[PDB]
Ligand binder design. Structure first.
Ligand SMILES: [Mg+2]
Length: 134
DNA sequence: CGCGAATCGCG
DNA sequence: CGCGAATCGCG
């Protein structure tokens, strides 16, 4: 399997797990930042990776793009394909925002179709995913 | 730490 | 038993 350069790559920047979560989607070839989510005060890295893929799906659908999405998160890929984010993070006032976003992302997946292939980025083969926060 | 996958205890 | 609940490997 080889890299598809004409694609979008996503990744999360965490400050702790759980902790502050941000993410972005970038052009795999050029590194152009296509979308970003500002820091969410608490969430898990998995939740952020799930949100990043769904945001990518929404972005690509709006643009009618057929580009695939790369994620380095096998867990988040599974959650998206299952249309169910199996997170164990407690639901309280503190975690209300991340859960609101996850619930809405699930709702989007359950009420839309999409053409975008969702592919696993192979870090051991290909090095850092282009959206890495470093 | 949080995950999915793989590996006890009570009814 | 056998079955859900509770407890390695990675990133
Ligand atoms: Mg990540």
């Amino acid at each position: 399997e080889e890299i598809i350069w004409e694609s979008l790559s996503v990744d999360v920047g965490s400050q702790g797990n759980p902790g502050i979560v941000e993410y972005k989607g970038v052009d795999t070839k050029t590194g152009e930042v296509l979308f970003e989510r500002e820091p969410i005060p608490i969430g898990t890295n998995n939740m952020g990776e799930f949100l990043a893929i769904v945001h990518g799906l929404r972005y690509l659908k709006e643009r009618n793009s057929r580009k695939p999405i790369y994620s380095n998160s096998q867990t988040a890929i599974k959650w998206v394909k299952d249309k169910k984010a199996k997170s164990t993070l407690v639901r309280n006032e503190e975690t209300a925002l991340i859960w609101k976003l996850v619930d809405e992302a699930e709702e989007w997946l359950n009420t839309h179709t999409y053409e975008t292939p969702i592919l696993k980025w192979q870090t051991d083969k290909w090095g850092e995913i282009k959206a890495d926060y470093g």
